[PDB]
Homo-oligomer: A and B are copies of this chain.
């Protein structure tokens, strides 16, 4: 028992982190087989980042202008190209620690682990969610760019995020590993802001099932609701609409606990309309929305990698 915000073990990703320097700009890269992936603004000086022409800046660079360091070892760059907002640096050595991996683009509401890195060295690991407004609530400083987010399934690392920038209010934005931004953001130092965020309804429901499994049951009421009537109530409280797909992914937790999804919705509806009256759920005074249904099943069943 117990329920914690849990990250994936980071070792498989640690073995892929490198340092990339171009000129005086340094950030992190991801070394998979004989390719290093990193944010393209490594080729910018401080003055270039407000209105960069990346194609022009890249045309002026040769392979040898990129200093790639894996630990205390320089990797020789033998090719380079740009794909959307990432650079791909071909190196003459394949990373022997390359895990089985794929590149995935995740959906808003899905969670992943971030391995925050500086100068190619890991600082820490934490779990976060792709918010409905396409930001993440991370913890990132200068030099953190190129840190990656990932999920693990058995032996396979699915990379889903590479870090590029910080938006107002201390939230973070980045790309998939093909260099395409999540959300409407661009890698330029300009006036950009995230849209209004929304609470991830299906994740709150998943976390309420986690609470029941841990014996924190006070919020269960005696009612049910229709999906439509729940969604009318949730809307006012800035919760996203609950879809039938969301209901379906809650199926395993509903079957395990015997609590119909729409019954849990009735209990959540009451929490939104009446508050928690100084009570906590799994130690939290606010409803938590950064556990997916699969996160709850993994943690409560002890899935390993």
Q: CB within 8 Å of B: which residues of A?
A: 1-12, 14-15, 115-119, 121-126, 128, 137-144, 166, 170-172, 214-215, 280, 283-286, 298-305
A127 to chain B, nearest CB (A): 8
A126 and B10 contact, CB distance less than 8 A:
no
Cα-based distance from A122 to B10 in the complex (angstroms): 10
List 15 additional A-B contacts (Cβ < 8 Å) besides A6-B126, A122-B305, A170-B214.
A1-B140, A4-B126, A4-B137, A4-B138, A5-B5, A6-B139, A7-B7, A8-B125, A10-B125, A116-B302, A123-B302, A124-B298, A141-B300, A141-B302, A142-B302
Copies of this chain, complex-wide, total 2
A7 and B124 contact, CB distance less than 8 A:
yes
Cα-based distance from A88 to B166 in the complex (angstroms): 48
Inter-chain contacts of A116 with B (CB < 8 A): 6, 302
Cross-interface CB contact of A170 among B2, B8, B117, B140, cutoff 8 Å: B2
Inter-chain contacts of A14 with B (CB < 8 A): 9, 11
Cross-interface CB contact of A9 among B122, B138, B139, B286, cutoff 8 Å: B122
A302 and B118 contact, CB distance less than 8 A:
yes
A12 to chain B, nearest CB (A): 8
Inter-chain contacts of A119 with B (CB < 8 A): 304
Inter-chain contacts of A9 with B (CB < 8 A): 10-11, 14, 115, 122-125
With contacts A15-B11, A124-B9 taken as known, whether A304 is within 8 angstroms of B117 at the C-beta atoms is: yes
B305 and A123 contact, CB distance less than 8 A:
yes
Task: Give the nearest-CB partner of A304 in chain B.
Answer: B121
